[PDB]
Amino acid sequence: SLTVKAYLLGKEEAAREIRRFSFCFSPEPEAEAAAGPGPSERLLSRVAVLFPALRPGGFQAHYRAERGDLVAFSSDEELTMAMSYVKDDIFRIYIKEK
Amino acid sequence: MSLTVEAYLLGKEEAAREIRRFSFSFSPEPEAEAAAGPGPSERLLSRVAVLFPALRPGGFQAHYRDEDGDLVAFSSDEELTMAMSYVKDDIFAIYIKEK
């Protein structure tokens, strides 16, 4: 399992709301239903129901890189890399509504 | 078994406004038929309301400290079972904040 921590940012980039959810170390939930994506579409799904303060699918999750800068990710291929940075079982990300 | 839950009221300067505690049951949920999903969360959030009338009845969010210490606004039973996993004693501390 892997707990993913999300950080809500308003106008002053200030933590608006904080929530976490238990994730599976597996690559994807389904094998047949999955039509390409998996982790991204899954995470972005929770963040929506967890952060109703903003649109359901009108937001972009930005993750810190080796440099620290923010990189709005939206693809499974990007997730597998994001986890490569964190050595622990905690995946932190910056949530921002479009 | 029993478990006392301590709540901390926060105003504008995040200063302790009011302090109150209530005896809780170690059981998973109070009812089995009436319960329509939730249990501990809906139960705790119920007391905090009657205990902290200074704010809205259901217009508040309880934040609990994590392994890191940061505040995590919880609102689901699944989140409660985890919060208790942190505290080893029979005292559950939480930060109450009115929306």
Side-chain angles (χ1 to χ4, degrees):
Chain A
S1 331
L2 304 168
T3 340
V4 184
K5 315 181 64 152
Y7 297 96
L8 223 187
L9 323 175
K11 185 264 148 171
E12 304 80 31
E13 314 198 37
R16 265 198 179 193
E17 194 72 75
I18 306 296
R19 208 67 176 288
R20 303 153 61 194
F21 70 86
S22 61
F23 194 71
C24 258
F25 203 97
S26 271
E28 302 177 30
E30 201 53 89
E32 272 162 300
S40 180
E41 171 177 25
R42 269 270 88 196
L43 159 61
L44 289 181
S45 248
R46 317 305 296 182
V47 182
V49 54
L50 297 166
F51 294 100
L54 53 107
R55 280 155 85 196
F59 76 100
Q60 255 307 135
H62 309 73
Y63 78 98
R64 60 133 196 81
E66 55 195 66
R67 301 190 77 183
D69 292 31
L70 270 178
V71 183
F73 75 89
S74 38
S75 317
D76 61 279
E77 66 85 43
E78 207 153 332
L79 277 302
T80 197
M81 213 100 287
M83 306 202 130
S84 202
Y85 296 85
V86 59
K87 205 89 159 297
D88 314 272
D89 46 271
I90 310 180
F91 183 46
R92 287 88 166 194
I93 49 167
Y94 292 70
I95 309 303
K96 265 201 156 209
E97 53 123 294
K98 301 207 299 179
Chain B
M1 270 287 294
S2 331
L3 304 168
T4 340
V5 184
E6 293 180 0
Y8 297 96
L9 223 187
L10 323 175
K12 184 264 148 171
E13 304 80 31
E14 314 198 36
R17 265 198 179 193
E18 194 71 75
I19 306 296
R20 208 67 176 288
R21 303 153 61 194
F22 70 86
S23 61
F24 194 72
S25 294
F26 203 97
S27 271
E29 302 177 30
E31 201 53 89
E33 272 162 300
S41 180
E42 171 177 25
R43 269 270 88 196
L44 159 61
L45 289 181
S46 249
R47 316 305 296 182
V48 182
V50 54
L51 297 166
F52 294 100
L55 53 107
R56 280 155 85 196
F60 76 100
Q61 255 307 135
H63 309 73
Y64 78 98
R65 60 133 196 81
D66 63 8
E67 55 195 66
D68 295 305
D70 292 31
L71 271 178
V72 183
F74 75 89
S75 38
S76 317
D77 61 279
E78 66 85 43
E79 207 153 332
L80 277 302
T81 197
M82 213 100 287
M84 306 202 130
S85 202
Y86 296 85
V87 59
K88 205 89 159 297
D89 314 272
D90 46 271
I91 310 180
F92 183 46
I94 49 167
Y95 292 70
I96 309 303
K97 265 201 156 209
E98 53 123 294
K99 301 207 299 179

